[PDB]
């Protein structure tokens, strides 16, 4: 009766859903007669089809998994999102968020991130030992690691691209490595182009990984979770992924290689984006603008419970999810988690889909699956990306 849309649908992320269910009872106990109705929708389905449709028709869920940047800006300007500054003041929470920028439109706040993310390279410390390689810090090191991994029968990069957004993760970072993080805002303001040779350098580097079989071959047939299977079952030396992936990686009778799992920032390439890491405060929950009194009370309770040090610590301890809020203790965690916090000290850039329009993101997904399938060249990809980028920029008016 009060709808709570989330994307925690995989069995592997059961602890994250169980936390949502705990939050849902606590809301119900706080608000008599309240009935919370959790609805899980697969991430890409929720974000790129279901929720955009509901927003256009004006009937979004009351509480919903929401992304900052482009998505929030679109629903704000359509009047769909509850402004959260009165509530944040009531609860004393506003300044326990180090970064709400993706959710701030004209100084006003329309969502709350539940996590801080980084994206980089998970690796198997025991496979690296076997191959007698150190952590690769630059491109030519990476090539050596990948060549030795493959020579020994390991997949260099566990990789699955049936879900198109997965292919864009390492890509994001590759073209930002070569062209700098300012390339992506440049795309939407018309001062940088997808076809520019410094952008293209990162695409060609990605294609080199394809051409050498360092990105897992046959990946177009595999759903996102399959790259995590390959890595956690010890078949791949590395996997480029987000920090949220540890919720599916390192516990119990699934994971051969739990303690020898590590993480490093992607090697430098001698380009304008060296020394940076993909990360930010992008994903959390938004709230319908159409809330009545019980509904608002439920949303306030949800905020009070979810955005607390108790729940932030719980999801860190249980599932490795890095906190979006300021914490008191935060101590005692898996090595891979130290290594991620370590790697997050670098200069940061947000995911490209927080900056570009939906149509551009969708086109990059489809273009990369064609590139992975050998059905488009890098030249064709960037030509098409730039045309769509021009159209999107014009349609912003
Ligand atoms: C709070 C949390 O852990 N959210 C995770 C999401 O961030 C993640 O989705 C992906 O996040 C990237 C970083 O913002 C985006 O660039 C990427 O587009 C996005 N993917 C989709 C399909 O929206 C998902 C992955 O399933 O896990 C969440 O738990």
Numbering used by the authors: 49 to 445
Task: Provide the authors' original text about this structure.
In conclusion, we identified and characterized Paenibacillus spp. Binding experiments of the recombinant NagB1 and NagB2 to several oligosaccharides using differential scanning fluorimetry and surface plasmon resonance confirmed that both proteins are SBPs of (GlcNAc)2 and (GlcNAc)3. SBPs, a component of ABC transporters, are responsible for trapping ligands that are imported through a specific pathway formed by two TMDs, and mainly define the specificity and affinity of transporters.
The crystal structure of NagB1 in complex with (GlcNAc)2 (NagB1/(GlcNAc)2) was determined at 2.0 Å. The asymmetric unit of NagB1/(GlcNAc)2 contains two polypeptide chains (A and B). There were no disordered regions, except for the nine C-terminal residues, including the hexa-histidine tag of both chains and four residues (Asp299–Lys302) of chain B. The two polypeptide chains were virtually identical and formed the same folded structure with a root mean square deviation (r.m.s.d.) of 0.57 Å for all Cα atoms. The overall structure of NagB1 adopts a typical SBP-fold consisting of two globular α/β domains: N-terminal domain I (residues Thr49–Thr162 and Ser330–Arg395; Fig. 5A blue ribbon model) and C-terminal domain II (residues Glu167–Met324 and Ala399–Lys445; Fig. 5A orange ribbon model) and three hinge regions composed of antiparallel β-strands between the two domains (residues Ala163–Val166, Ile325–Tyr329, and Gln396–Pro398; Fig. 5A cyan ribbon model). Domain I contains five β-strands and seven α-helices, whereas domain II contains five β-strands and 12 α-helices. The ligand-binding site is buried at the interface between domains. In both (GlcNAc)2 bound structures of NagB1 and NagB2, the first GlcNAc interacted with the tryptophan residue Trp213 of NagB1 or Trp217 of NagB2 and formed hydrogen-bonding networks with surrounding residues. The O3, O4, O6, and O7 atoms of the first GlcNAc formed hydrogen bonds with Arg95, Asp401, and Ser330 of NagB1 and Arg96, Asp408, and Ser334 of NagB2. The second GlcNAc unit formed a CH/π interaction with Trp292 of NagB1 or Trp296 of NagB2. In NagB1/(GlcNAc)2, Arg64 interacted with the second GlcNAc. Although the structure of NagB1 in its ligand-free form has not yet been determined, considering the conservation of a.a. sequences and three-dimensional structures, it is likely that NagB1 undergoes the same structural changes as NagB2. Thus, NagB1 may trap (GlcNAc)2 and induce the expression of chitinase genes, such as ChiW, via a phosphorylation relay in the system.
